[PDB]
Design a protein around this ligand. Structure first.
Ligand SMILES: [Cl-]
Length: 207
């Protein structure tokens, strides 16, 4: 239920969190701890780079912008590396993952503060994705996922079952534990017994 967001990047990051949390400027080394009640589903945490806000919480960001506002209520504009989770009250299990479906912008580590074996352990995505990003998907500060750039069933899996693509394999290749495309569920979903642990999301785990 407790999620700790830590910015270990050498640059400032504007953490964002829905549906609870909002937004927060995080300078190098700063942490933000938010409480997520049991039953919180379809939640996500991400970081925003190159933002420019004025006293009122209005401005714009280079990546992951959520409507030109500091405290998000909606989703960020890709590309942005995602930390998704659902604290299910029915199975009493925590379902979480790192997703690249909406792109990549900042490397991160998603981990249980109390790993208990099985699929309940830290996962990472620290590859140099922005650096090796295919030219067709590359944007300032990030690397978009083929579904965002090209669209269509092939990449977005909007019409029905889909499979990996050469462009999706570019991400899975570099971050095996993360979602490379919409239906990359089997090797991208992790769980922990609900109530048995807390969570930590850190930007630039390798500094
Ligand atoms: Cl709670």
């Amino acid at each position: 239920a407790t999620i700790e967001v830590r910015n270990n990047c050498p640059y400032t990051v504007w953490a964002a969190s829905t549906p609870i949390g909002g937004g927060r400027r995080l300078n190098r080394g700063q942490t933000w701890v938010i409480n997520a009640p049991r039953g919180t589903k379809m939640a996500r945490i991400w970081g925003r780079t190159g933002c420019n806000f004025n006293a009122a919480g209005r401005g714009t960001c280079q990546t992951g912008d959520c409507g030109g506002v500091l405290q998000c209520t909606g989703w960020g504009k890709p590309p942005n590396t995602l930390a998704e989770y659902a604290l299910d009250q029915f199975s009493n299990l925590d379902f979480w993952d790192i997703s690249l479906v909406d792109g990549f912008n900042i490397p991160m580590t998603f981990a249980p503060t109390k790993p208990s074996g099985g699929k309940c352990h830290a996962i990472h995505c620290t590859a140099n994705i922005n650096g090796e990003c295919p030219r067709a998907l590359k944007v300032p500060g990030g690397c978009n996922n083929p579904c965002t750039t090209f669209g269509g069933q092939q990449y977005c899996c909007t019409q029905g079952p889909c499979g990996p693509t050469e462009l999706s394999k570019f991400f899975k290749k570099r971050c095996p534990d993360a979602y490379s495309y919409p239906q990359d569920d089997p090797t991208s979903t992790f769980t922990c017994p609900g109530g048995s642990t807390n969570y930590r999301v850190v930007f630039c785990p390798n500094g």
